[PDB]
Design a protein around this nucleic acid. Structure first.
Ligand code: ATP
Ligand code: ATP
Ligand code: MG
Ligand code: MG
Ligand code: MG
Ligand code: MG
Ligand code: MG
Ligand code: MG
Ligand code: MG
Ligand code: MG
Ligand code: MG
Ligand code: MG
Ligand code: MG
Ligand code: MG
Ligand code: MG
Ligand code: MG
Ligand code: MG
Ligand code: MG
Ligand code: MG
Ligand code: MG
Ligand code: MG
Ligand code: MG
Ligand code: MG
Ligand code: MG
Ligand code: MG
Ligand code: MG
Ligand code: MG
Ligand code: MG
Ligand code: MG
Ligand code: MG
Ligand code: MG
Ligand code: MG
Ligand code: MG
Ligand code: MG
Ligand code: MG
Ligand code: MG
Ligand code: MG
Ligand code: MG
Ligand code: MG
Ligand code: MG
Ligand code: MG
Ligand code: MG
Ligand code: MG
Ligand code: MG
Ligand code: MG
Ligand code: MG
Ligand code: MG
Ligand code: MG
Ligand code: MG
Ligand code: MG
Ligand code: MG
Ligand code: MG
Ligand code: MG
Ligand code: MG
Ligand code: NA
Ligand code: NA
Lengths: 527, 50
RNA sequence: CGCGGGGUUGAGCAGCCUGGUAGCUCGUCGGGCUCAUAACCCGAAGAUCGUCGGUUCAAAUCCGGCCCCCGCAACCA
RNA sequence: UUGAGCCUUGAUGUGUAGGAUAGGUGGGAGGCUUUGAAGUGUGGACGCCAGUCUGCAUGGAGCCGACCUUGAAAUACCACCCUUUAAUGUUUGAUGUUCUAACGUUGACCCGUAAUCCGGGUUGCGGACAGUGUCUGGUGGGUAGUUUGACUGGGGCGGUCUCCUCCUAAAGAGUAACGGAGGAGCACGAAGGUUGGCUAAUCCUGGUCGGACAUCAGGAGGUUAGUGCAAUGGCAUAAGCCAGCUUGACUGCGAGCGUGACGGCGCGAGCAGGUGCGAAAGCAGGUCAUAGUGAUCCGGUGGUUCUGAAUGGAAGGGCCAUC
RNA sequence: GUUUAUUAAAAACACAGCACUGUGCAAACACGAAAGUGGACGUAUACGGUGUGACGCCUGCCCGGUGCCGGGAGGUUAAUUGAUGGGGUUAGCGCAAGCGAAGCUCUUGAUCGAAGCCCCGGUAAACGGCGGCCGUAACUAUAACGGUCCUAAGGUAGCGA
RNA sequence: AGGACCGAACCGACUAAUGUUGAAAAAUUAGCGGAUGACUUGUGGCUGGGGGUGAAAGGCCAAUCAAACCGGGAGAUAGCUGGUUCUCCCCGAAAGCUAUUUAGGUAGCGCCUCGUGAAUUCAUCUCCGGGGGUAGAGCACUGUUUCGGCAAGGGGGUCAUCCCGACUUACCAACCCGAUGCAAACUGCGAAUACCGGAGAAUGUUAUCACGGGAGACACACGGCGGGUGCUAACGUCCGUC
RNA sequence: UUUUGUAUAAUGGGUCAGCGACUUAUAUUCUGUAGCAAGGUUAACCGAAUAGGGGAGCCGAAGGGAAACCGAGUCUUAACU
RNA sequence: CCAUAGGUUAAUGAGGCGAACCGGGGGAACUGAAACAUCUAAGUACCCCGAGGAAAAGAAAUCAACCGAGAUUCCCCCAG
RNA sequence: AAAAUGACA
């Protein structure tokens, strides 16, 4: 029955959203959208109350429950699946860890005497004695099979990893700050599943995804944060699209009315100024110009990064040579033989529902995971560029934005010709003097597009490129690969990116891996 | 201009602050100087605030 | 030498919009179609962004001076 | 017709693992059943579809419970409530049709009356609409009160209005003009403090790319360089150039002066308390100095019993810091 | 025909004629703090406001701006309603700081909330508007013609020192 | 028949003269337009002051109209003009600075006057201790400038005009050397006066300072000297000093 | 009269006679003089009423501080040479 | 229909004038702020209604302050 | 669907 309040935040130069003043409450789900690298994730991170803003407008509601799914979908490879879901209850988790230091403590103290009783009575009061079982039924209820309940999250497919992480959020909370960009789970089947779960649950939830269609079926209000602040536009998404791109147009027309009215008062002032009979009237509109004050126009953060990949040697005959792969981790092998040939092109969109091993195919196609195969036989002068599905080991050791980008080069100069490439994809002068690990989402992805700019990889992979991009970098990336000369073997989950971009399909289903149907406008047409 | 006003609130618990200016665009991190607190009559640390 | 606006490829124009790619329509040229010329199809050429400086890693773009063009003003008893 | 709240009753609510679609608290293991049963057929409704379920006589009198995998026991039992839900009433909102009884009638007829006013009566038509009162949003030169700067080689236009540097300024200070020339509305957590150390521009010769001009080695020169920012004065004991440690860019005061009609502005040895650098003598109360800035009222934030309109509090003031 | 009695008698005002627009009658509109009157003892072939001004040939393009008319989907929005959160006081709990029921209070303000405006169309005998640069025809000149930029549209018929 | 035609009564007012302390606070004379119509006229009514009426001029509303007349608020306010009345004695200015919705007003100080209280307090001259950067001068610096010598270097042409540049020029020409000038914003030099401080005699009805009562004034003018501006023009204009 | 300045050809006045412009009330400050003097003095009012009662009250003898408060001291400051 | 409205008659009272004072219903602006709009001038000028020799007010749901005073009205202080 | 033109002798 309560609502949230206002905040204001800044991570350095040019503060971000500058005195937001909004309220979220009721049952309506405020779909929060915005360009890459602008508020959004960190705006509602403040809303969760774990970190406080700079200007400190404060937004308090400390009585009810908040459950938050975040963007770091791989932030726990260690905790078992049952532990991650239980940890969604913050009070239960922190109590248990200090309680669990019983069998790990060989000697007990006097003050520990009632302390262990004090923690145990709190455990029973919030009934932690059923948390493992309470989560298990819910965990089974979202589609995770029993046999992987006790397994580690390292050995769970990222598409499945969202189903666990949504179960963590759903812990009887009447609001959820969903950072859910349904990146990995875009099977349409799983997407359609997540649309039913959220729609038929009554909560004052917030959704942040970039999927235009997904926001239609679920969200009722939109909270675009584009120029310097967030404005709430009711309507789904395409009733929004008119107003947001019309209120801008009506401002440019109003702004250009004054700029054309001033320029016509300057006709009188510049003509009848020295005149003795008309001077008192020209100085009546010479001081009327000084009272118009046309309102300033700010630039939208929804810019279009300009990326293009160019070759270095351009092999001519063919790239791939796979005889028989027969790779399986701990169950029935995900593929049997997979005889493959690329023939210098054939952008080879790998497909399939999540959890069938398309990412483990690419990982062993590049030679990281050793298969029981007989080698993959790269070409004579292949320069492989890799964009892994998960990319977090690269962004470590606290290098800066300029530092991280700099080492990747072969002949270009260190000061210029890498600032331009790094700055071409929307990195301002003050944005490159901060650690490269503090970047967020699309900027992490945009770095790996820039990484292949200077590298000039003759052969490309791009495991899952269109994950966190902001619907404009996707249009740029789709255009960048379209005129690309060379070979790339990508696996994408959405339809339009695969359909428009050149393709030679290789779908993976147990057990036969269907190879080739042409345009992917015919692959579905054959069905 | 681009230089705005801050206050260094003491750490000795008492309410005392030296007010200065600091450029935020170049450096967005806090300021830590050991200054004099006349309320307790000692040199203590003054973390930036406001 | 008082005040505004402008100088970009052969012509007419964007791009200056908060600095990271020299672009549109005609035009010239070389092929093709045709008996031949137009129309049309394919391919390429040219610009020191008026000049000279100044912060910039980086300037058509930001600042300063000069040149050239187009307007307007230089009042009433 | 449809939303919202309230009461009453009845229904209502698993996978993991089983004899089973068990909500929570644990009081208890004996209730239940014939104020007609076990099973039988017969129908709703609900139903992560097996079942709960209750109108139904007949059949007529045994079923349940403990145990059993379980994180937990069991419609075996009752109570105190929870979830979702239907029915009554229950108070209210929204809309739609109707109704007369407020109200309107500048429709008709009768009377006061020898009266196209007014009042009363009968009736017809509208009918909770219209209209009026208080409050309120929009529009409102229809109307009213007023404003619309100064210097100025007459007035207007142009220029200017506060601060800093040089000349005019007549070798102390000051000194005007719409006199001649340029700048400011900042910057710096180091570009401040201290200790240690260092000395430039420009030329010649010789030297791979290398070039009138990069970096290097010698010699002449002497500060013609440098100073975050315009100009003047200054600077080798460097105030210019490097590095180590640091916060004195600190709190309360301040003899004595300088400059202003005042408001004010500036310099300052030294005293008290606590720091920094150095072995120590000592230096340090911002920066080589001069521009980088606006009084009072009104209000905002923090601290502090100073006051607190009978008393105890408090609101509100005061003082200190600050916007 | 009328007009500045007392320096202007006119090209000014009026006019018959034309058009737009309002008004269904207790008409619009006007004088009235109101009752009431005029409009009119008239009823859309009537009445009021605005502009043009006999008669003849005619009255071109522009709805972007400002007005007026229509639309109701959506955004913003007053009074009214007072859900929540914070403070003041204190019965009590402690014979420490401190905490704080009920009530009374100060304040914040969830929900309901029309016209208007934003938005979508129309209207110019509604107020108003109606373009540049470059090249080109057998001597010269000029462009019937072409390119391009912009605009809501670029001044047509007629007339022209 | 006609808002028809010519034309007296009647209604008007187009031209000229006179008149202008008039016969008249708009008329007389000679001509002039309408004169059966939207005409003219007698008597009586109605509309009133931000209102009336207006064939529309801001016209008329009692010789008064961009808001009538009378009385009242009322002795509105006037930083603006004018005026300010008997006598003698003593002293005796300013027309400047600063600020100003300020510039012809005012406020504080400077200048005047009256009273009180104080120091060889103050003024002139001689001697002593001082800091200048003006006049003048000078060209080491900042600029500028003319000669003469050397000459970097930038050009001009001659070659296979491919390289090395191999030969040339009637060229210009920076830095230094010698000579010659100029400067408010130049100074390796630098007065006279003025100013500040100290000591000393004489002279001066305290002439000096502080406080307190009362002001006026803040429009200046010409002349000499040093200047800015102007034309080294103005009884021009802005400063310093007399 | 107004001015830097007037015979000024800048204002005013034809002459005479009469009238015509710094006042009154209540407060505050300074000077002179008179009374009393660490004290001075009443107002309204009563009053056979310019006497006499009336000391309500005002000024002064003590200041400092925003204030509580302290007091020939007091404020600032943790404290002042 | 009763009755009311209306009509006539009789008795009583009022009407209008007046200088100031008094209570009530309305209520400006010039002016000052060195302009002006909050404010001031001012509840003043003026208009209207009513009454008396006087008129209004008047007998605490008032003050004070842990001591007390005792309706209303007028004058001097408190006090600029 | 688009399809213009061709000096005398
Ligand atoms: N710790 C930080 N401190 C200061 N500024 C930060 C910090 N972290 C991020 N930023 C800045 O804030 C920006 C916004 O980051 P944020 O996490 O909000 O991403 P986002 O806009 O939600 O992006 P995406 O849509 O890709 O998830 C970053 O690009 C960076 O410039
Ligand atoms: N290290 C591992 N140990 C055990 N099982 C693994 C391991 N890695 C992958 N798997 C399993 O094998 C399959 C391979 O999945 P993988 O992680 O390669 O991604 P994917 O199937 O392509 O999924 P998505 O489309 O969601 O990215 C999955 O079923 C996953 O659970
Ligand atoms: Mg007006
Ligand atoms: Mg007035
Ligand atoms: Mg003036
Ligand atoms: Mg001097
Ligand atoms: Mg001098
Ligand atoms: Mg002077
Ligand atoms: Mg420095
Ligand atoms: Mg040193
Ligand atoms: Mg230093
Ligand atoms: Mg300096
Ligand atoms: Mg009290
Ligand atoms: Mg306070
Ligand atoms: Mg006529
Ligand atoms: Mg006339
Ligand atoms: Mg006339
Ligand atoms: Mg009528
Ligand atoms: Mg006309
Ligand atoms: Mg027209
Ligand atoms: Mg006639
Ligand atoms: Mg007439
Ligand atoms: Mg006549
Ligand atoms: Mg006629
Ligand atoms: Mg006639
Ligand atoms: Mg008459
Ligand atoms: Mg008259
Ligand atoms: Mg008037
Ligand atoms: Mg008056
Ligand atoms: Mg008068
Ligand atoms: Mg006046
Ligand atoms: Mg004398
Ligand atoms: Mg004046
Ligand atoms: Mg000289
Ligand atoms: Mg003056
Ligand atoms: Mg003067
Ligand atoms: Mg003078
Ligand atoms: Mg003169
Ligand atoms: Mg004089
Ligand atoms: Mg004169
Ligand atoms: Mg004379
Ligand atoms: Mg003369
Ligand atoms: Mg004479
Ligand atoms: Mg005279
Ligand atoms: Mg005169
Ligand atoms: Mg005279
Ligand atoms: Mg007299
Ligand atoms: Mg005292
Ligand atoms: Mg009477
Ligand atoms: Mg005034
Ligand atoms: Mg005045
Ligand atoms: Mg009485
Ligand atoms: Mg008592
Ligand atoms: Mg042709
Ligand atoms: Na994010
Ligand atoms: Na994968």
């Amino acid at each position: 029955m309560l609502v949230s309040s206002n905040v204001t935040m800044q991570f350095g130069s040019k503060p971000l959203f500058e005195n937001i003043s909004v309220k979220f409450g009721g049952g309506n789900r405020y779909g929060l959208i915005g360009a890459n690298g602008s508020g959004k994730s960190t705006f509602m991170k403040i809303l969760g109350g774990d970190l406080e803003p700079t200007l400190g407008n404060v937004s308090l509601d400390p009585n009810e429950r908040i459950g938050k799914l975040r963007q770091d979908q791989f932030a726990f490879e260690e905790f078992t699946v049952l532990d991650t879901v239980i940890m969604g209850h913050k009070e239960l988790w922190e109590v248990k860890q200090e309680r669990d230091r019983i069998y790990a403590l060989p000697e007990m103290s006097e003050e520990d005497g009632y302390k262990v009783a004090d923690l145990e009575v709190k455990y029973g009061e919030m009934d932690g004695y059923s948390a493992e079982a309470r989560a298990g039924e819910l965990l089974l209820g979202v589609g995770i099979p029993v046999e992987q309940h006790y397994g580690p999250m390292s050995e769970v497919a990222p598409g499945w990893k969202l189903r666990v992480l949504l179960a963590q959020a759903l812990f009887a909370d009447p609001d959820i700050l969903l950072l859910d960009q349904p990146t990995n789970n875009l099977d349409i089947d799983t997407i359609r599943w997540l649309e039913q779960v959220l729609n038929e649950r009554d909560s004052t939830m917030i959704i942040i995804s970039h999927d235009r269609h997904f926001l239609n079926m679920v969200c009722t209000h939109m909270a675009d944060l584009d120029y310097g602040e967030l404005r709430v536009y009711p309507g789904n998404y395409d009733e929004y699209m008119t107003a947001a791109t019309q209120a801008r147009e009506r401002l440019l027309a109003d702004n250009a009315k004054k700029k054309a009215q001033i320029a016509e008062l300057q006709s009188f002032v510049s003509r009848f100024s020295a005149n003795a009979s008309k001077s008192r009237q020209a100085t009546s509109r010479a001081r009327q110009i000084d009272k118009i004050k046309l309102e300033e126009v700010k630039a939208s953060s929804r810019q279009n990064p300009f990326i293009r990949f160019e070759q270095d040697k351009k092999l001519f005959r063919n790239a791939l040579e796979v005889e028989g792969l027969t790779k399986g981790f701990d169950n029935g092998p995900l593929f049997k033989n997979l005889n493959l040939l690329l023939e210098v092109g054939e952008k080879l969109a790998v497909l399939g529902t999540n959890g069938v091993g398309k990412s483990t195919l690419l990982k062993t196609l590049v030679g990281d995971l050793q298969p029981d195969s007989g080698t993959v036989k790269w070409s004579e002068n292949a320069r492989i560029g890799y964009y892994a599905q998960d990319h977090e080991y690269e962004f470590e050791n606290d290098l800066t934005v300029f530092e991280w980008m700099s080492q990747w080069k072969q002949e270009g100069d260190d000061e210029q010709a890498v600032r331009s490439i790094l700055g071409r994809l929307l990195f301002s002068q003050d944005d490159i003097k901060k650690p490269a690990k503090v970047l967020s989402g699309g900027e992490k992805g945009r770095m790996l597009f820039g990484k292949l700019m200077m590298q000039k990889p003759n052969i490309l992979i791009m495991d899952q490129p269109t994950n966190h991009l902001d619907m404009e970098s996707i249009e740029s990336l789709n255009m960048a690969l379209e005129l690309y000369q060379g070979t790339l073997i990508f696996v994408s989950h959405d339809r339009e990116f695969v359909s428009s971009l050149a393709t030679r399909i290789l779908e993976i289903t147990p057990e036969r891996v269907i190879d080739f149907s042409g345009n992917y406008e015919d692959y579905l047409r054959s069905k | 201009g681009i230089r705005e006003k801050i206050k260094l609130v003491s750490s000795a618990g008492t309410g005392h602050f030296y007010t200065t200016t600091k450029n935020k665009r170049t450096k967005p991190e806090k300021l830590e100087l050991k200054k004099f607190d006349p309320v307790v009559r000692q040199h203590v640390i003054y973390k930036e605030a406001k």
